[PDB]
Swiss-Prot record, chain C:
The gene is rplK. Keywords: Methylation, Ribonucleoprotein, Ribosomal protein, RNA-binding, rRNA-binding. InterPro entries: Ribosomal_uL11, Ribosomal_uL11_bac-typ, Ribosomal_uL11_C, Ribosomal_uL11_C_sf, Ribosomal_uL11_CS, Ribosomal_uL11_N, Ribosomal_uL11_N_sf. This is Large ribosomal subunit protein uL11. The lineage of its organism: Bacteria, Pseudomonadati, Pseudomonadota, Gammaproteobacteria, Enterobacterales. Part of the ribosomal stalk of the 50S ribosomal subunit. Interacts with L10 and the large rRNA to form the base of the stalk. L10 forms an elongated spine to which 2 L12 dimers bind in a sequential fashion forming a pentameric L10(L12)2(L12)2 complex. Signal peptide: none annotated. One of its GO terms (biological process) is stringent response. It comes from Escherichia coli (strain K12).
UniProtKB/Swiss-Prot annotation, chain D:
GO terms for cellular component: cytoplasm; cytosol; cytosolic large ribosomal subunit; large ribosomal subunit. Belongs to the universal ribosomal protein uL10 family. The chain holds residues 1 to 131 of 165 of the full protein. Keywords: Acetylation, Repressor, Ribonucleoprotein, Ribosomal protein, RNA-binding, rRNA-binding, Translation regulation. This is Large ribosomal subunit protein uL10. The gene is rplJ. GO terms for biological process: cytoplasmic translation; negative regulation of translation; translation. It comes from Escherichia coli (strain K12). One of its GO terms (molecular function) is ribosome binding. Forms part of the ribosomal stalk, playing a central role in the interaction of the ribosome with GTP-bound translation factors. Protein L10 is also a translational repressor protein. It controls the translation of the rplJL-rpoBC operon by binding to its mRNA. Part of the ribosomal stalk of the 50S ribosomal subunit. The N-terminus interacts with L11 and the large rRNA to form the base of the stalk. The C-terminus forms an elongated spine to which 2 L12 dimers bind in a sequential fashion forming a pentameric L10(L12)(L12)2 complex. Two L12 dimers associate with a copy of L10 to form a very strong complex (called L8). Ribosomal protein L8 appears to be an aggregate of ribosomal proteins L7/L12 and L10. It comes from the Bacteria. The modification N6-acetyllysine is found at residues 37, 105.
Curated annotation (Swiss-Prot), chain E:
GO terms for biological process: cytoplasmic translation; negative regulation of translation; response to radiation; ribosomal large subunit assembly; translation. PANTHER family: RIBOSOMAL PROTEIN L25/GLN-TRNA SYNTHETASE, ANTI-CODON-BINDING DOMAIN-CONTAINING PROTEIN, RIBOSOMAL PROTEIN L25_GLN-TRNA SYNTHETASE, ANTI-CODON-BINDING DOMAIN-CONTAINING PROTEIN. This is Large ribosomal subunit protein bL25. GO terms for cellular component: cytoplasm; cytosol; cytosolic large ribosomal subunit. The keyword Cell cycle does not apply. Keywords: Ribonucleoprotein, Ribosomal protein, RNA-binding, rRNA-binding. HAMAP family: Ribosomal_bL25. GO terms for molecular function: 5S rRNA binding; structural constituent of ribosome. It comes from Escherichia coli (strain K12).
UniProtKB/Swiss-Prot annotation, chain F:
Belongs to the TRAFAC class translation factor GTPase superfamily. Classic translation factor GTPase family. TetM/TetO subfamily. Disulfide bonds: none annotated. This is Tetracycline resistance protein TetM from transposon Tn916. Abolishes the inhibitory effect of tetracyclin on protein synthesis by a non-covalent modification of the ribosomes. It comes from Enterococcus faecalis. It comes from the Bacteria. The chain holds residues 534 to 639 of 639 of the full protein.
Length: 38, 136, 141, 131, 94, 106
RNA sequence: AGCCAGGAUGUUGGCUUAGAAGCAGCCAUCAUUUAAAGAAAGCGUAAUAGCUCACUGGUCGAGUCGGCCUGCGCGGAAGA
């Protein structure tokens, strides 16, 4: 998974969460869009 | 890269970048990328930021460049001790004061220009914003 | 009335029997034979004319052939023998390629009304004529 | 959605169609198709023109809002998805029976064809119309 | 709806001007005709939302000071160097 | 101007994979061609250059899961190809007068 | 905000006849039937088909959405 400094929503089904303080972008659609950090 | 066609002098003093900018109002286009940050845009950054903007709006639209370098910046060659004269002008820069309109654009939708100026801003070191030509 | 299964509105001039460069694999893409669009394709075509691209329903079943009700040619190609020029757009408002008149196009519009769906003819009129407007053609009202 | 002017506009427009209206019927296509749009509304074209309004907007504060000024008995028709069907040419025309027959003509459902108001009655299949 | 409440200034200069403009209010002035110029401070937010209409830079305004109403025009105006805010307005008397 | 072989390539694959074989079309220089169903089996008349045709057997072999089958024959010398018009040396030697031909070049 | 509904005939439209068929690029960006529907934002096709969103019904029943300005914080932040 990507761990970029910037984590904007790629697909439409991307959703921003902030688990354990660390911001993440979970995508229920495409597993490639899953990313951390930012 | 933008560069003066012949000048009175080849090298010039560093100088300070103090003060508010004069290019405050939008004067040509309907929009603009005003420079909030205090810096010194090099020629390569203007040509580069322009590319990543002239392409962003495709063949349509019209862009103005409100700044021009006209300040030669010298550099000392690597592994050379201090002294022995002023270095060699390696590149040209334009000093940028806060509130200094950089790029202007017309003939494009407000949102399209809104996206085009995000990319050119991405290319530029100084902090920027977005402005619109208010009638008087 | 069963929904979507295989019916597709695609074929060239109705005078071109058993096509392969135009349609070919497209009509015989399913289990239906290539022969089915020549022996049966002109069984209704001969009654009117030939050389006119007229769409027909192709609701394929497991019963070899299929049920169909032929419809109506597009206004676009109708505007060649009924427009003068065989061309069309490319330059819509950039130049006036051709022109007809509401007295003729409204006159042809109600002919296709067997396929068209409208509460009154006038509507179909401005509809089809506007279709003509898209071609760079401007109606001489 | 556009504000009060437009909602109220369409509603008062519906009220003007009751001023010169007559027989009406219900219809509830929870699973309708545009194919059926070209049956009852093509039938509208078979009657005269565009004027006929299925105006499916039975919000208790929308279509039922135009109810207190015209036909208050239709207030109980309000609940669930409902589309009122007014008429104008031919008093007590055949538009009513076409909902019952059309529903049996591949249309899933039709609000249990309870009908509306001419004798202030209820769900009643009636061929008893001026023919 | 062009009407703005605006008190009379007392301490003019770079000093009180900055204390004032850094208080959600900014200075301005009404001048024109034979009358001597009247220095007039007014609320920021309002006027900031007022320049959102072109009629603010053409149609006559009616600034209310000490009960007395002054019909005016926005002859001149100074934006902030870059921040979305005003700094000063020249209301030439109409 | 370069000219290359473009022999037709008929192929017979199961219809369920027949869409996937269409994906092979984009991956190959060969143009789409008329084809027809044959019971559960499906068939299509291809037409691709011999230079890339050799991998086509591997392609049908992979897409069909070994169920694939195909056949082809050379035809149509006309075709044209790119890019740079590369050519295979060389001619010629073992004959008199070639030195005069070398003289002609300069 | 979620919820089964709907989201059309020619448009195989002229285009360089190999296709561009709402969606490579063109320009046009029709108008009807209408509670609504862009001759279409995305996906998927050799191109279709197909799957979505715009939009609008109803179910539903009270506040909710998007910018601006700023305060203080999180990430970006790895060495013997």
């Amino acid at each position: 998974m990507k761990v970029r400094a910037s984590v904007k929503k790629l697909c439409r089904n991307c959703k921003i969460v902030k688990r354990d303080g660390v911001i993440r972008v979970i995508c229920s659609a495409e597993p490639k869009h899953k990313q951390r950090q930012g | 890269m933008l560069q003066p066609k012949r000048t009175k002098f080849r090298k010039m003093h560093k100088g300070r970048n103090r003060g508010l900018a004069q290019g405050t109002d939008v004067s040509f286009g309907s929009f603009g990328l005003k420079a909030v940050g205090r810096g010194r845009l090099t020629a390569r950054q203007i040509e580069a930021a322009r590319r990543a903007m002239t392409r962003a709006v495709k063949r349509q639209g019209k862009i103005w460049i409100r700044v021009f370098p006209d300040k030669p910046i010298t550099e000392k060659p690597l592994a050379v001790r201090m002294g022995k004269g002023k270095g060699n002008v390696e590149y040209w820069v334009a000093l940028i004061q806060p509130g200094k309109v950089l790029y202007e654009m017309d003939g494009v939708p407000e949102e399209l220009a809104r996206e085009a100026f995000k990319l050119a801003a991405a290319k530029l070191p100084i902090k920027t914003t977005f402005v619109t030509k208010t009638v008087m | 009335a069963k929904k979507v299964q295989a019916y597709v509105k695609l074929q060239v001039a109705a005078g071109m029997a058993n096509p392969s460069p135009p349609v070919g694999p497209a009509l015989g893409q399913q289990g239906v034979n290539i022969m089915e669009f020549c022996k049966a394709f002109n069984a209704k075509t001969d009654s009117i004319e030939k050389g006119l691209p007229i769409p027909v329903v192709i609701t394929v079943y497991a019963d070899r052939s299929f049920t169909f009700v032929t419809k109506t040619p597009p206004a676009a190609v109708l505007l060649k023998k009924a427009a003068g020029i065989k061309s069309g757009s490319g330059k819509p408002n950039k130049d006036k390629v051709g022109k007809i008149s509401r007295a003729q196009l409204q006159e042809i519009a109600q002919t296709k009304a067997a396929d068209m769906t409208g509460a009154d003819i006038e509507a179909m009129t401005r509809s089809i004529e506007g279709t003509a407007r898209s071609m760079g053609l401007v109606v001489e009202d | 959605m556009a504000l009060n002017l437009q909602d109220k506009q369409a509603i008062v427009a519906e009220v003007s169609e009751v001023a010169k209206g007559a027989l009406s019927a219900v219809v509830a296509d929870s699973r309708g198709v545009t194919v059926d749009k070209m049956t009852e509304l093509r039938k509208a074209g078979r009657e005269a023109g565009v004027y006929m309004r299925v105006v499916r907007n039975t919000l208790l504060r929308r279509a039922v809002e135009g109810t207190p000024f015209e036909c208050l008995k239709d207030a109980f028709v309000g609940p669930t998805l409902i589309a009122y069907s007014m008429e104008h040419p031919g008093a007590a025309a055949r538009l009513f029976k076409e909902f019952a027959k059309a529903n049996a003509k591949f249309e899933v459902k039709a609000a249990a064809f309870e009908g509306e108001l001419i004798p202030a009655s209820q769900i009643d299949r009636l061929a008893t119309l001026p023919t | 709806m062009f009407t703005i409440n605006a008190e009379v200034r007392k301490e003019q200069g770079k000093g009180a001007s900055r204390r004032l403009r850094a208080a959600n209010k900014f200075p301005a002035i009404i001048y024109g005709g034979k009358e001597a110029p009247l220095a007039i401070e007014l609320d920021h937010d309002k006027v900031m939302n007022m320049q959102a209409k072109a009629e603010f830079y053409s149609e006559v305004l009616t600034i209310v000071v000490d009960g007395k109403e002054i019909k005016v025009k926005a002859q001149d105006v100074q934006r902030h160097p870059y921040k979305p805010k005003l700094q000063h307005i020249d209301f030439v008397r109409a | 101007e370069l000219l290359e072989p473009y022999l037709s390539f008929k192929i017979y694959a199961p219809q369920e994979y027949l869409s996937r074989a269409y994906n092979d079309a984009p991956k190959y220089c060969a143009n789409i061609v008329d084809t027809q169903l044959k019971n559960n089996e499906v068939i299509l008349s291809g037409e691709i250059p011999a230079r890339c045709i050799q991998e086509y057997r591997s392609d049908l072999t992979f897409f069909t899961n070994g169920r694939s089958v195909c056949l082809t024959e050379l035809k149509g010398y006309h075709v044209t190809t790119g890019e740079p018009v590369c050519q295979p040396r060389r001619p010629n030697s073992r004959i008199d007068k070639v030195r005069y031909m070398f003289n002609k070049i300069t």
